[model samples]
Target: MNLTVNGKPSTVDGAESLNVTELLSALKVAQAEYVTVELNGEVLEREAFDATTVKDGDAVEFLYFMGGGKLEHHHHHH
Candidate 1:
């Protein structure tokens, strides 16, 4: 499928359909939980991600806000 993501041309192969969650996974988004998805110009709610499927020729956008604070990471060692 020929789709646009974040204004860049992207393609999905070997698939007839893909939901928002799948799309993010396929794209290997670093932080799927922190990204906002816009499908064909409409902002989708977090709950709708599983239900919204993106097809060929569809336009999608992923926006990140960073939560307005320093993004910190902590690794726990066993």
Candidate 2:
């Protein structure tokens, strides 16, 4: 089966599926908790990754607002 992931076309030998967390972790890429994922244009909720499955011709998209580092300090005026 052919699937375009992150704009790259690839093939999977057979009907294979990994839980959402497994899939993301398996990817040879960094998956920060802040990233957002879309399968076939459908948004995947964070807690729902366990049930999300991928298959042939599925177009998965990942998105995020890139930042230099985690926010830990805030100086606000009251």
Candidate 3:
């Protein structure tokens, strides 16, 4: 299948269609467990990965948000 992933054209062999879960595995997305998927401009819930199917010409995006850090606090008094 021919699809655009992260703004770059990508293709997956041996399959005409694939579910989000399989797509992730095929594309070898890093840290997939923590990644968020968007299909055709719609955000897919984690539970939908297995249900959503991706076909040719579809747009897929993987988003990763980093957390678990302390924010800097600054206070100024004059």
Candidate 4:
């Protein structure tokens, strides 16, 4: 499957689809709990990662906040 992650194009192989949590692993995202995710323009709640499915051509954004060694999650809506 293909994805546009963080404004960059990406592809995932060996699977038909994956959930948001799986996507995080595939992307090697660090600090998963501190990351904010937006899927196809909709902000996903942190508690919904396991239930959110990402398919081909899905636009995903992994957003986070970092300042003075502190990380924050501030871009989520819902």
Winning model by lDDT: 4
Per-residue lDDT of 1-78 in model 4, one digit per residue for the tens? 888888889876756789999888877778888777788789888788898888888788977556476668789897
Give the C-alpha miss distance for residue 4 in model 2, angstroms.
1.2
Q: Name the lDDT of candidate 4.
A: 0.81
TM-score for candidate 3: 0.68
TM per prediction: 0.71, 0.60, 0.68, 0.71
User: Can you write out model 1's per-residue Cα lDDT over 5-44, one digit (the tens) per residue?
Assistant: 8888988776779899888787667876666778879998
Tens-digit lDDT track of model 2 for 3-37: 67778787656647655565577553375464577
Clashes of each: 0, 0, 0, 0
All candidates' lDDT scores? Answer: 0.80, 0.66, 0.79, 0.81
- lDDT per residue (tens digit) for residues 1-78 in model 3: 888887879876758679999878876777766768788789888688889988887888866567658877768668
10 residues in a row with least lDDT, candidate 1: 62-71
Q: Is candidate 3 or candidate 4 better by TM-score?
A: 4
Models ranked on lDDT: 4, 1, 3, 2
List the lowest-lDDT window of 10 residues for candidate 4: 62-71
Q: Give the distance in Å from residue 20's predicted Cα in candidate 4 to where it truly belongs.
A: 0.5
